[PDB]
Amino acid sequence: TLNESKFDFGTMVQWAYDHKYAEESKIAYEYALAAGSDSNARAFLATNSQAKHVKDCATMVRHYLRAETQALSMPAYIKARCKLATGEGSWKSILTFFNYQNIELITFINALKLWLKGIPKKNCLAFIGPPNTGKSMLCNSLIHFLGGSVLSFANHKSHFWLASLADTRAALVDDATHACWRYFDTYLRNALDGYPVSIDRKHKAAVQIKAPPLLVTSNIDVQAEDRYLYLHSRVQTFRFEQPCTDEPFNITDADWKSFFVRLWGRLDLI
Amino acid sequence: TLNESKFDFGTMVQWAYDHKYAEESKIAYEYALAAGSDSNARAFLATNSQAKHVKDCATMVRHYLRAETQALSMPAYIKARCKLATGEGSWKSILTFFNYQNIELITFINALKLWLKGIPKKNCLAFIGPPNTGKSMLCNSLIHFLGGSVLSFANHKSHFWLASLADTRAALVDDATHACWRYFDTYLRNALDGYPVSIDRKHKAAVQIKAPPLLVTSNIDVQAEDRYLYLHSRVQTFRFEQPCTESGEQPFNITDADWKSFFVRLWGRLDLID
Amino acid sequence: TLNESKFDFGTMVQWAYDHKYAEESKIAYEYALAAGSDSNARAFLATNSQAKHVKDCATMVRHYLRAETQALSMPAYIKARCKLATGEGSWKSILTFFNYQNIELITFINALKLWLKGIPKKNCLAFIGPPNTGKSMLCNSLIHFLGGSVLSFANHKSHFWLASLADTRAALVDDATHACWRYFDTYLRNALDGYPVSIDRKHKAAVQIKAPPLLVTSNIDVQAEDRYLYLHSRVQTFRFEQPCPFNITDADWKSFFVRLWGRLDLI
Amino acid sequence: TLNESKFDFGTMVQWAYDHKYAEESKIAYEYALAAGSDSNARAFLATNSQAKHVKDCATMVRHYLRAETQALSMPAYIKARCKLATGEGSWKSILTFFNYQNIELITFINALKLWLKGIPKKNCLAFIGPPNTGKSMLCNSLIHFLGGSVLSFANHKSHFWLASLADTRAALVDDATHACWRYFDTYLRNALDGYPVSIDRKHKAAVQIKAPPLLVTSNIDVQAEDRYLYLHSRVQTFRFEQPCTPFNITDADWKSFFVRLWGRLDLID
Amino acid sequence: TLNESKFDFGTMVQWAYDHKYAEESKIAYEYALAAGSDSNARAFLATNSQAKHVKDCATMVRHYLRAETQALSMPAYIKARCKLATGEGSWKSILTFFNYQNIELITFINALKLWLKGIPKKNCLAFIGPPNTGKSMLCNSLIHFLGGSVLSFANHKSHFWLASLADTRAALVDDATHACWRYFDTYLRNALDGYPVSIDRKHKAAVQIKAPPLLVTSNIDVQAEDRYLYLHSRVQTFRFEQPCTPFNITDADWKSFFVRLWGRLDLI
Amino acid sequence: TLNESKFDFGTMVQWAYDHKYAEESKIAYEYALAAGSDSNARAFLATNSQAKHVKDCATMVRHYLRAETQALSMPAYIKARCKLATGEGSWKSILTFFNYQNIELITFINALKLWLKGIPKKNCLAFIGPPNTGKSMLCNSLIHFLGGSVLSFANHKSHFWLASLADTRAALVDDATHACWRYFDTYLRNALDGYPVSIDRKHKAAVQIKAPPLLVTSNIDVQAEDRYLYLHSRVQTFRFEQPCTDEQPFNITDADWKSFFVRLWGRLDLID
Ligand SMILES: [Mg+2]
Ligand SMILES: [Mg+2]
Ligand SMILES: [Mg+2]
């Protein structure tokens, strides 16, 4: 990784942004390789304050990626995620699965439509059923396509476990336990009703935001439980009953792309 | 975007202040956009210390914004908030709602007049009743109009969860559970009173300040509960009993313009004069 | 506000000190205003380092302010506090109120005389009774007159919640609940006693310092409670039984101290 | 040592990288030595900001080294672990150990092959048996060879215990207690199934990642206990029955193992 | 005050050292005062980096002061402390008090002699009894005379609550509650014995240092309690039973005390 | 002291290293005194950044010292530790003490031989008994002689408490309680096995090192307790039952160990 034999920070930040590198060690290493055929990368290794620049650069790119994701409307955002979708699947892969899980495409399309706008009480789609019915399967594939984030209720003892809600456009709380559902009930009523929540971030002061769209998976039916009365009118549920087990379903990013490109009209994304 | 290519800090701050951009990412990104037709934004992308300038800009803006909000009296402040609101509105929306909850508007007016002045033991209004009675609805609309902040009891194990009290002119805790009331009872009587309190802020120094007016929504009626005895005298309760939804429509929705109408109409009786 | 447009730091500090502006936001903003008719304020908005100047200014002003407060004897200090108060006032307001609570003013004068000197086991006065008996009312007015600080037990899980004790000449804990009394009993007897106490400051290192005089208000009568046995000796209790609202101003206290100067041993 | 007397930082970093020194103290010391014969090292000692340069050099090196290893394929990584490990080595060492515990070698090779590929349900090999059957012995030896990390699940207090997973190519859970298995059962199905998990770290932001391959050692046979029904298809148990008190597996043993069985572990690059 | 208007750092440090000003706020303020008749203090208010200078000055003075204190043996140190004390004083004040508590002064002298040497298992003296028996009174007067530090168990949840142990020659814990005694029992046996301990300091590296001689006042009799068994051996207890407040030991009293009992306290 | 009226930092570091001053307090003060003769020390006192220079100097020094110390073999190290120990002393007092506790010195020697090489399951020696049996004093004298560190379970809630396992050649946990033994049982297993573990820092670097030979003193007998079964084979226990409750109590010193090590150098397999 030859490191030896006037530096503009702009040019570097640019390069990092273009390549979507946000992480210092990557930025550092990757720019050092570019220096074979890049004058500014060559000038960088001549600098004494490399470590400072690598840091700054990460901070710079982290600022931009974060703030452009926030700036785009939900349609433009989905549009962006469609462009990122490589390979080729089909929206049919998705329909086939719902058919298998005996749920209405139409029900889903509506739910999703309103979930995407983050309309109050329509902001949270639960995917409920016993183990191995492809709940994780579908939800994670959707989050992936969407550029979402997974929240782990394991980390709930720290209140920072919600930090990413100040960032994503969609979020998934995987495998909800009772603990977790009543957590929702206790603390997050406002996330469901589209009122503001103070989300604490680690190295800087907390921010007040509207909680982005939420997915949940669970073995637990909230609508069928009395102790979660508040949740009934705020959580849209879908039950999966059907096994997915061979030593058959794998929704891809292109599957979702086709799904959105094709039902774009029906999802009110115009 | 284009992030690439002498800089004056003040100008960037001027900019950020004008656009009321206070938050680092927005400041950096939004300015990087201004780069196309602003030589200062172009120069910003030429320096090696952009990260720091963004950082300092946010500090500077926050300083100014806080400072100007604290300087204003309640009247002058509400005045500026009225100036900010837009759209079609009427105080009748508010009247209708209180009337729907079988509460005379004057009862609320009397309470609000004192609450706004932050008079001791009158510094806290709680809206209380069964689910879906428009409690969060009303309180949030008001807090929004006032530019107040929401406190999130989910963050209460942190020292800094109260940090906003050093800045806003009104504050809301939405859906106070039993754990929540107890915390308030044990640790926060005098803030509920609107007495001076030491508010700890993250990176900065603790600040001693008059606790701003408080709003609470809750399913728990503190006045009826013997175990919250000591909260009875410092919390004025409004009981919302009537449903504000079937899950067909939601008929009651108060806008900023409704409050603008409200304060303008009732400027006199809320003693917000000279 | 205008934020755009050779800078001298000292002049900015001078300014900040003069106006008693000690906090960064206020300093920054208020100085940016002075910019219309102040070349140094103008020059401040021209520098690319204004962020740290505001920071340093705040630091510098609190250094001075703290240092000048600490330097004054209690008499000299109260003197300056009297100078500061304005408006119409009378110690009678205070007499009336203690009389209303069926307490002779002299009982309070005696206790206060010692409390001000920060005499061990006498460093803490507690105002105790059922709700709405003007406990917080009185204590807060006094703390205000004195320029003392409020302690917020709510922050007690932090290391720095006592940090003001390194600066003020008097402190108040308003509405001590059982949890509050217990914490004090367990951890802070010496603080109550007004003995030297190690006080953790946020970014600076700790200081060993004598703890200022203390005021507490509470519904809990510590004197009557066997489980707060060890607090009985270090806390003088004033029972406020009568309800009410009535108000004590700074000018009332000014009148109070001026009138009772000699009787308070303030030489 | 001499620490007395124009400096180019990159040159130092270059040097440090070459000798694989990621260690402030080591860096500082070694440079100050390589200095009566390096114009730059001399120049370094002339500078007043030496302390800063050492700190930066470390940072810079640990960046490069970390980033260069993160970028390898699993096969390429093992090839690196093979270069890195030297000594008296034979795989005969391991084969007899398996033969002693009555596990067929091929059962293990296969399992490892699919494990190194982090295929879901093939992502977590448990080694199970009563105290003192060389479970730690073997797993530590392997994880060491591979440069993976060791995790201890205490109880509640273990909040950040997974923090290393954010970074290693492989990991070992040392003596899974029953509660540790319940933790998997409750919170880790996604990790085992190939899905992202949020991993909380100390004084930095949480990360989301695919869980590295896991080794577990326990006295608790999860295949037997129905209260862990959901792990049965996700965890592959190797049972160690025989007590051992001599056997000892080394970096050099694993090297020989991997080189010998390379084609059979499907590492073809 | 005036803070407005070539600066030598060393001179400010010299000044600060001379006046024993160790505290940023005091250093800043007190120097800004010296500005009327000191060209260096004037120059200080001309620099734009005065904030850093105040900070570095305190650091610097702290360095020197610490280093001086650490260099001296116990005798030489007490010597310096005696030199510092002023006023009318008599060891008889101390004698009378111990006699009032029905304790022979020699009992205290014997214990104090060893305590001062920081001999293992003898490094901790505890003054114990019902309220208002002059416990805090006495221990505080001594800790003051010695220039020792108070530890505040209130801050024990912090890593640096023991940071002063890297600097002072004697330390006091005033009113040890049950929570206090337990913490000591669990975590600080070695510190009570006066063995080395790793002391965490704010902007500095940890130092391993002999925990200095300890004083404790308390209402709790550790020797009588079975659950504080492991403290019995490392804690010498003086029981103060008789009520007092009048009784008031000054620095000059201690000066008299050490001067009189120099040989008898073995201070060669 | 005098701290008043170009500077070269390397020169200050040279001085500090030679004099082996690694604490800022000392570096600061001592260099200030050396200003009369040495005129770099003079330059130092004329800089406005004196404070930083001290800070950086301490850093720089302790870097070097840590680095030479790791480079040494255990043999060569103990040698330097003997070279460092001063005063009159004898190994007899070590013999006297074990014999007092009814233990053959050779039981101790054997253990120590293996413990110094850091052999798996021999890496930790424990001295276990009722209060007042010479446990702490024996261990401390050894650790002191060895230049090792004393870990404080007080700060255990922050992993940073093991930071010094990165630097020192031997460590002592004085007076282990149940809480502390449980800690070993879950975390420090690998330490008792020769397999490297990850040590953290306040100045976050996050290294991995083989764990130094450990000493523990305790009123708790681990071999007697099942909740500590793992530790049985990995902790070598020396039971001290005889009390020393009767001006200056018994005392082992650096010189006592110095001779102990010079005399028993052979038998301890320290040969090279
Ligand atoms: Mg009150
Ligand atoms: Mg006392
Ligand atoms: Mg012991």
Question: Between chain C and chain E, how many beta carbons pairs sit less than 8 Å apart?
Answer: 128
Q: What's the CA-to-centroid distance between E133 and ligand 2, angstroms?
A: 8
F chain contacts of residue D246, beta-carbon cutoff 8 Å = none
CATH homologous superfamily of domain A73-270?
A: P-loop containing nucleotide triphosphate hydrolases (3.40.50.300)
* D265 min Cα distance to partner chain F (Å): 26
Of B66, B197, B200, nearest to C25 by CB-CB distance is B66
Compute φ and ψ for A229, nearest 5 degrees: -55, -45
Does domain B73-274 bear CATH number 3.30.9.10? Answer: no
**CB–CB contact D24 F205 (8 Å):** yes
Distances (CA, A) of D151 to D30, D188, D216, D217, E153: 33, 14, 10, 11, 34
**CB–CB contact A206 B163 (8 Å):** yes
- What residue spans in chain F does CATH classification 3.40.50.300 cover? 73-272
- What residue spans in chain A does CATH classification 1.10.10.510 cover? 1-72
Report which of E121, B112, D94, B238 is spatially closest to residue F249, judged by C-alpha positions.
E121
**CB–CB contact B47 A193 (8 Å):** no
| Surface of F (78-117) touching E: CB under 8 A | none
Distance, CA of B230 to CA of B189 (rounded, Å): 9
Which of E12, E60, E188, E197 to mutate to probe the F interface, most F CBs <10 Å?
E60
E chain contacts of residue C191, beta-carbon cutoff 8 Å = 152, 154
Which of A2, A5, A21, A25 to mutate to probe the D interface, most D CBs <10 Å?
A25
Question: Contact A180/A196 with Cβ under 8 angstroms?
Answer: no
Question: Contact A63/B24 with Cβ under 8 angstroms?
Answer: yes
Report which of E189, E178, E250, E239 is spatially closest to residue E214, judged by C-alpha positions.
E189
Other C-beta atoms within 10 Å of D192: how many? 21
What pairs with residue E143 in β-bridges? none
Q: Is E246 on the interface with C (CB under 8 A)?
A: no
DSSP class of F223: T
Ligand nearest to the backbone CA of C120: 2
Residue of A nearest to D16 (CA): A3
Resolution in A: 3.0
Question: Contact F65/F72 with Cβ under 8 angstroms?
Answer: no
Question: Contact E64/E58 with Cβ under 8 angstroms?
Answer: no
Q: What six digits make up the tokens of A177?
A: 């336990």
3-state secondary structure chain C: CCCCCCCCHHHHHHHHHHCCCCCHHHHHHHHHHHHHHCHHHHHHHHCCCHHHHHHHHHHHHHHHHHHHHHHCCHHHHHHHHHHHCCCCCCHHHHHHHHHHCCCCHHHHHHHHHHHHHCCCCCCEEEEECCCCCCHHHHHHHHHHHHCCEEECHHHCCCCCCCHHHHCCCCEEECCCCHHHHHHHHHHCHHHHHCCEEEECCCCCCCEEEECCCEEEEECCCHHHCHHHHHHHHHCEEEECCCCCCCCCCHHHHHHHHHHCCHHHCCC
Angle, CA of F70, F76 and F79, to the nearest 5°: 120
Report which of D115, D173, D101 is spatially closest to residue D139, judged by C-alpha positions.
D173
Cα B133 vs. chain centroid, distance in angstroms?
A: 21
Report which of A91, A94, A173 is spatially closest to residue D196, judged by C-alpha positions.
A173
Residue of A nearest to B177 (CA): A186
List of residues 6+ apart from C152 with CB closer than 8 A: B187, B190, B191, B197, B198, B199, C161
Amino acid at E250: T
Compute φ and ψ for E107, nearest 5 degrees: -55, -45
Cross-sheet strand order for the sheet of B236-239: B149-151, B171-173, B214-218, B124-128, B236-239
Q: What six digits make up the tokens of E141?
A: 């007067």
Residue length of chain E: 268
List of residues 6+ apart from D161 with CB closer than 8 A: D151, D152, D153, D154
Q: What's the CA-to-centroid distance between E229 and ligand 2, angstroms?
A: 23
* C254 min Cα distance to partner chain E (Å): 25
Does domain D73-269 bear CATH number 3.40.1010.10? Answer: no
Helix H or strand E segment including B209: strand B207-210
- The residue whose two tokens read 């920072």 is A160
Q: What six digits make up the tokens of F189?
A: 């297993």
DSSP secondary structure of B41-76:
HHHHTTSS-HHHHHHHHHHHHHHHHHHHHHHS-HHH
- The residue whose two tokens read 């003296």 is E125
What pairs with residue B128 in β-bridges? B218, B239
Q: Is E73 on the interface with F (CB under 8 A)?
A: no
Distance, CA of D226 to CA of B136 (rounded, Å): 46
Give the SS3 label for residue F231.
helix
- Say if strands C207-210 and F124-128 run parallel, antiparallel, or are unpaired: unpaired
Phi/psi region, residue E263 (left: phi>0; alpha: psi -120 to 50; beta: rest), is alpha
Chains with 3+ CB–CB pairs under 8 A to D are A, F
- The residue whose two tokens read 């379970």 is F153
Give the SS3 label for residue B125.
strand
Compute φ and ψ for D68, nearest 5 degrees: -70, -35
Report which of C110, C128, C185, C174 is spatially closest to residue C148, judged by C-alpha positions.
C174
Which of C198, C228, C233, C235 to mutate to probe the E interface, most E CBs <10 Å?
C198
- The residue whose two tokens read 């009862």 is B107
Compute φ and ψ for E120, nearest 5 degrees: -45, 140
Residue of C nearest to E139 (CA): C195
C chain contacts of residue B193, beta-carbon cutoff 8 Å = 136, 174
Report which of E170, D10, C255, E205 is spatially closest to residue F62, judged by C-alpha positions.
E205
Chains with 3+ CB–CB pairs under 8 A to A are B, D
Cα C177 vs. chain centroid, distance in angstroms?
A: 20
Alpha helices in A85-158 (DSSP H): 91-100, 105-116, 135-146
Experimental determination technique: X-ray
Distance, CA of A253 to CA of A80 (rounded, Å): 13
**CB–CB contact A233 B132 (8 Å):** yes
Query: Helices A50-71 and A39-46: crossing angle, nearest 10°?
Result: 130
Which of A14, A52, A198 to mutate to probe the B interface, most B CBs <10 Å?
A198
Q: What six digits make up the tokens of A153?
A: 């209720």
Q: What six digits make up the tokens of C98?
A: 């203690």
Of A63, A188, A204, nearest to B28 by CB-CB distance is A63
F chain contacts of residue E16, beta-carbon cutoff 8 Å = none
* A260 min Cα distance to partner chain D (Å): 23
CATH architecture of E73-268: 3-Layer(aba) Sandwich (3.40)
Q: What six digits make up the tokens of A80?
A: 């962006």
Amino acid at C239: R
Ligand nearest to the backbone CA of C230: 2
- What residue spans in chain D does CATH classification 3.40.50.300 cover? 73-269
Ligand nearest to the backbone CA of E244: 2
Distances (CA, A) of A257 to A215, C37, D146: 19, 61, 39
Q: Is B194 annotated as a binding residue?
A: no
Number of H helices, E strands in chain D: 11, 7
* B269 min Cα distance to partner chain A (Å): 30
Sign of the CA dihedral B105, B106, B110, B116? Answer: positive
Query: Helices D50-70 and D24-33: crossing angle, nearest 10°?
Result: 120
Helix H or strand E segment including A74: helix A74-84
**CB–CB contact B154 A197 (8 Å):** yes
**CB–CB contact B247 A230 (8 Å):** no
Of C50, C174, C175, nearest to B60 by CB-CB distance is C50
Question: Contact A151/A171 with Cβ under 8 angstroms?
Answer: yes
**CB–CB contact E229 F131 (8 Å):** yes
Question: Contact A137/A244 with Cβ under 8 angstroms?
Answer: yes
Cβ burial, residue D6 (10 Å; 0-12/13-18/19+):
exposed
Distance, CA of F193 to CA of F191 (rounded, Å): 5
Cα E170 vs. chain centroid, distance in angstroms?
A: 5
CATH T-level assignment (fold) for domain F73-272: Rossmann fold (3.40.50)
Helix H or strand E segment including B198: strand B196-199
Distance, CA of B71 to CA of B51 (rounded, Å): 31
Ligand nearest to the backbone CA of E174: 2
**CB–CB contact B153 A187 (8 Å):** yes
Compute φ and ψ for F8, nearest 5 degrees: -120, 115
Of C26, C45, C51, nearest to B59 by CB-CB distance is C51
CATH homologous superfamily of domain C73-267?
A: P-loop containing nucleotide triphosphate hydrolases (3.40.50.300)
Distance, CA of C263 to CA of C114 (rounded, Å): 11
**CB–CB contact F230 D131 (8 Å):** yes
Q: What's the CA-to-centroid distance between F219 and ligand 3, angstroms?
A: 8
**CB–CB contact F186 D58 (8 Å):** no
* D174 min Cα distance to partner chain F (Å): 9
Q: Is A35 on the interface with B (CB under 8 A)?
A: no
Sign of the CA dihedral D106, D112, D114, D119? Answer: positive
Helix H or strand E segment including E15: helix E9-18
Distance, CA of C126 to CA of C219 (rounded, Å): 10
Q: Is B150 on the interface with A (CB under 8 A)?
A: yes
Ligand nearest to the backbone CA of C217: 1
Q: Is F157 on the interface with E (CB under 8 A)?
A: no
Q: What's the CA-to-centroid distance between B224 and ligand 1, angstroms?
A: 21
Ligand nearest to the backbone CA of C219: 1
Distance, CA of E228 to CA of E186 (rounded, Å): 10
Long-range Cβ contacts of E139-143 (<8 Å, 24+ apart)? E139/E172, E139/E174, E139/E215, E139/E216, E139/E217, E140/C195, E140/C196, E140/E172, E140/E174, E141/E249, E141/E250, E141/E251, E141/E253, E141/E254, E142/E170, E142/E215, E142/E249, E142/E254, E143/E170, E143/E171, E143/E172, E143/E215
Question: Contact B58/B150 with Cβ under 8 angstroms?
Answer: no
* B143 min Cα distance to partner chain C (Å): 23
Distance, CA of A205 to CA of A207 (rounded, Å): 7
Cross-sheet strand order for the sheet of C124-128: C149-151, C171-173, C214-218, C124-128, C236-239
CATH code for the part of the protein at E1-72: 1.10.10.510
Compute φ and ψ for A217, nearest 5 degrees: -110, 155
After which residue numbers is chain B interrupted with C–N beyond 2.5 angstroms?
5, 245
Question: Between chain E and chain F, how many beta carbons pairs sit less than 8 Å apart?
Answer: 122
Q: Is E197 on the interface with F (CB under 8 A)?
A: yes
Cβ burial, residue A194 (10 Å; 0-12/13-18/19+):
middle
Alpha helices in chain F (DSSP H): 9-18, 24-33, 39-44, 50-71, 74-84, 92-100, 105-117, 135-146, 178-186, 254-263
Distances (CA, A) of C16 to C7, C80, D32, D51, E5: 15, 19, 49, 37, 15
